[PDB]
Design a protein around this nucleic acid. Sequence first.
DNA 1: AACTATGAAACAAATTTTCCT
DNA 2: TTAGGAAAATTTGTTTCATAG
DNA 3: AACTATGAAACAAATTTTCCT
DNA 4: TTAGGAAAATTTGTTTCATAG
Lengths: 83, 83, 81, 79, 82, 79
Amino acid sequence: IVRPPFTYATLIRQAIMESSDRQLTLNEIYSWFTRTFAYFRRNAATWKNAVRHNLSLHKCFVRVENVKGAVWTVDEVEYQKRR
Amino acid sequence: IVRPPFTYATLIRQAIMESSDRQLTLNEIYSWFTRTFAYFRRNAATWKNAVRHNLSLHKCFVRVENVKGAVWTVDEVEYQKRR
Amino acid sequence: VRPPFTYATLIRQAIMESSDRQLTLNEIYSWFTRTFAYFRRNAATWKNAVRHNLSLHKCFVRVENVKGAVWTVDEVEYQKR
Amino acid sequence: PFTYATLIRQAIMESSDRQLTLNEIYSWFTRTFAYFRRNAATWKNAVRHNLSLHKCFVRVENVKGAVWTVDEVEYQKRR
Amino acid sequence: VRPPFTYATLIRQAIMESSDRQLTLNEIYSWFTRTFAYFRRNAATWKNAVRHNLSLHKCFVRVENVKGAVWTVDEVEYQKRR
Amino acid sequence: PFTYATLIRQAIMESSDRQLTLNEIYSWFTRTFAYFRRNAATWKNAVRHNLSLHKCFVRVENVKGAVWTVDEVEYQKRR
DNA sequence: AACTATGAAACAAATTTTCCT
DNA sequence: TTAGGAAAATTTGTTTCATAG
DNA sequence: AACTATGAAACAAATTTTCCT
DNA sequence: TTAGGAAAATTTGTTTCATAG
Ligand SMILES: [Mg+2]
Ligand SMILES: [Mg+2]
Ligand SMILES: [Mg+2]
Ligand SMILES: [Mg+2]
Ligand SMILES: [Mg+2]
Ligand SMILES: [Mg+2]
């Protein structure tokens, strides 16, 4: 098994960008990771922690609260900075 | 953390070829893996199983019993076949 | 062509492979339970497994004759295991 | 009991010229797996029937309970 | 060159940060124990950590002037952490 | 209480011009870590001494046990 | 080809915040 | 009104990776 | 650029074998 | 001499990866 050659930030952005409304709940993001790569079908304690850490740490990922909870979105302009 | 871009057989051969007498016990091979790459400092249940599996499966790795137990060696001619 | 297996050949196998060369009905049932469970696989599964075994085990050698390709068994390399 | 290796050997071993193409091995496995699928729900009664029908299977009653044995001479007479 | 810390400023910090602005001697000791344990780090450790924090937190802005580059604190940006 | 951020901020805030080069921050941390290393075995007695020496620290005896408080007015004079 | 130095990423954790029994 | 638990977030400090010199 | 087919590798496990309490 | 335990080996069958076509 090989981990994808992309950063967590890039992968998370990919997940969100591929969604129909450009937004995903945390659990939906986890699902995208496990469905897409074999690497994420094990050691969940490690990679899910990485995902949450990246979502909070990086300003390009903005939590948008809504009636049923909250979804994560991507501030593309922000994502582009430093990259 | 990234796993080395080499097969288990290639890494095992490397460990043995670097030893002073071209022989290593199983525990010494585990130690070479952990000392050499961060990747092998976690999920021991998985990679140690991989190492034992590779040692038995591939004919290029020959167990040589000795007074103190047994060491693993490499049949270079064999390793070269299929490669 | 003779069937690969029959209840008779299977019952004989169960008994012959046993310790005392004897089995109670319940023991024969246990053996059959395990055996039928093993075969409850699909073509996609066994087909993959067959190719895997032919290219992994040395006892299986492919002899190319005036037909295309045929696999044979090296009994001497088969016994060692 | 069975492994793909023993099965592949059985197929090849039980064929004249002791050879088989990959397609022929596939055919043998198809027949074999079909057999077990077809009889997955009948083997219990089939076994009881065979035990009492064929003389090669002899019931030996010992201390506690009874056991079944094979009369190899009788068995080898069927073929 | 007044010291960055003195027992006096530390004792006051422990008491001021407390719930009811008052601590027993033992509570002050517990605070000091934790504090001294935090600082038991080597130069290789804190040096790395300092560079890490300067380039991670936006409240720390490098204002490049005349010669060399000096940092500074964005009191407002630091407000979030407050 | 303390994080590298609060410390870096403390250093810069206590400096003139409220600015510091990376080397100056390094100097401040060197002095700071040196302080805690130097006094790792003396702080218990040092704390007891300071509490009874400085009037800004007042011992208030309530129901069970006694607690220490800071007389903010007194503390500020000396600064 | 080695080796060092170093920021971005990755990691491992300790805490916090919310929503529910 | 608290007490806990699980998710979800937020934070901190350390280790690893990729590479410019 | 996509997609399929497929052998090598990688995985996950069930068992075995040895050496010691 | 039987009963585990753990490390070391051996085995089997399934999933993943890289890539020819
Ligand atoms: Mg964010
Ligand atoms: Mg071997
Ligand atoms: Mg082979
Ligand atoms: Mg009969
Ligand atoms: Mg920053
Ligand atoms: Mg006093």
